[PDB]
């Protein structure tokens, strides 16, 4: 009945003065915009239909046309930034915010979804949705004693839209908006649905991707233990955002990092640092690199949890990006560590893989490795065992690699290699 209409027929129906004809044409538009392959969004926009749909959003007496137009506009807003902008330019934001209070749950859900797409376009539309007052009604939709009474799809859509309100930087979301959203986010972070958990973790990861004051806003809510628990989940879609959030948090101050450690995060890293998903391994090793950049007691907790052998493992075999993160972790470790910690590192077998990685073409990883070797040599000097370390490097085939780097294009690599050769070889 409303299937496979032409845009011409849709226009004729919507331009009729008959609300039922308008409803049928709007539903045909919705079905066109819901097709799997290349929905004709641009044709619908060029036909001038967005203002009509937006006006239909306000037909409180015809809830079906509200729903159909909300769905059509949601799918238009799901397209390119220009198509989302076409929806915003038609006045859709305040109309959808008004629909958030609809007594019909499917209409409220559709408005939530549409605002999620609009905010997901970027920081400008995110902040514009916020300025029009979306957060209060959105959060009111979740003000129930037990989230489990809400329909699963409804709650998932609310969580996703809230996550888009937390997303993007340059600028980051307004501080007052983040403080307004965070308590509901914590509650959602304790929900049992895997998709709600995943999107809540993503929102926290966004909110912690910034300066230390944003991180502090988050960690003062006490969510770090829940994030560690989720770090241990079996569902990769939960572990990925949980790990991103924990890594962001350990980019902060030593005290925030210590909050991560105290919550028991390090005990999860034997599995994370051997995870079959390359992205998990890379992100876990980056997190480790930022933990080894911390205090000597924090390096010591890395040692106690038995993680140095796992760093040697990643450095020995992993995708190259993860090996680069591991090199960074080793260099930070040797920069901040005691002499005893550095000798422990050597005793775990770091030198041979660290030397094998000097065969790489990336200049940055070579510089990182040369810095680490210099630090290890400084510790050896403090112990008077520099000759033993030199022999160690020579047996690995590393002296050849260093003396070869003496002929490298980068000045820093050149000078560092020559300095090592002159002082210790």
């Amino acid at each position: 009945g409303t299937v496979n209409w032409s845009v011409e027929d849709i226009v004729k129906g919507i331009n009729s003065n008959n609300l039922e004809s308008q409803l049928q044409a709007t539903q045909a538009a919705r079905k066109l915009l819901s097709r799997e392959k290349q929905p004709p969004i641009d044709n619908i926009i060029r036909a001038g239909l967005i203002p009509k749909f937006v006006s239909f959003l306000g037909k409180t007496d015809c809830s079906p046309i509200q729903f159909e137009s909300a769905w059509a506009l949601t799918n238009i807003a799901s397209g390119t930034s220009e198509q989302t902008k076409a929806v915003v330019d038609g006045g859709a934001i305040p109309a959808f915010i008004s629909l958030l209070a609809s007594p019909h749950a499917h209409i409220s859900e559709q408005a939530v979804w549409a605002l999620g797409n609009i905010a997901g376009d970027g920081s400008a539309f995110r902040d514009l949705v916020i300025k029009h007052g979306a957060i209060d009604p959105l959060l009111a939709l979740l003000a129930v004693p037990d989230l489990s009474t809400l329909a699963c799809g409804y709650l998932r859509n609310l969580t996703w839209t809230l996550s888009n309100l937390c997303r993007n930087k340059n600028p980051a979301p307004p501080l007052d908006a983040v403080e307004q959203i965070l308590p509901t986010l914590v509650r959602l972070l304790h929900h049992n649905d895997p998709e709600v958990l995943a999107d809540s973790c993503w929102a926290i990861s966004y909110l912690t991707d910034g300066p230390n004051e944003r991180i502090e806003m988050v960690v003062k809510k006490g969510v770090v233990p829940q994030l560690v628990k989720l770090l241990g989940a079996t569902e990769l879609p939960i572990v990925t955002p949980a790990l991103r959030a924990i890594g962001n948090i350990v980019t902060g101050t030593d005290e925030q990092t210590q909050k991560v450690i105290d919550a028991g995060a390090l005990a999860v890293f034997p599995s994370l640092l051997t995870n079959p998903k390359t992205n998990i391994q890379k992100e876990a090793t980056w997190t480790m690199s930022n933990i080894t950049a911390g205090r000597q007691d924090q390096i010591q907790q890395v040692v106690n949890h038995g993680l140095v052998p796992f760093l040697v493992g990643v450095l020995s075999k992993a995708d190259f990006k993860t090996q680069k993160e591991a090199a960074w972790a080793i260099t930070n470790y040797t920069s901040g560590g005691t002499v005893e910690q550095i000798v422990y590192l050597v005793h775990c077998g770091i030198i041979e893989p660290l030397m094998n990685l000097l065969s790489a073409k990336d200049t940055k990883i070579i510089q990182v490795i040369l810095d680490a070797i210099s630090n290890i040599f400084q510790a050896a000097e403090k112990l008077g065992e520099t000759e033993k370390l030199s022999i160690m490097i020579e047996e690995c085939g590393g002296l050849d690699k260093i003396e070869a780097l003496q002929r490298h294009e980068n000045e820093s690599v050149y000078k560092a290699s020559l300095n090592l050769i002159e002082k210790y070889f």
């Binding site: 819901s34 799901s78 979804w113 980019t251 980056w286 930022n290 950049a293 960074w328 930070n332």
Partner: peptide
């Protein structure tokens, strides 16, 4: 030894079409 922040996301827009 300084902390290193995460790389900028290359996914700049997050939108969902309702099928």
């Amino acid at each position: 030894a300084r902390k290193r922040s995460h790389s900028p996301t290359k996914k700049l827009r997050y939108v969902k079409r309702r099928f």
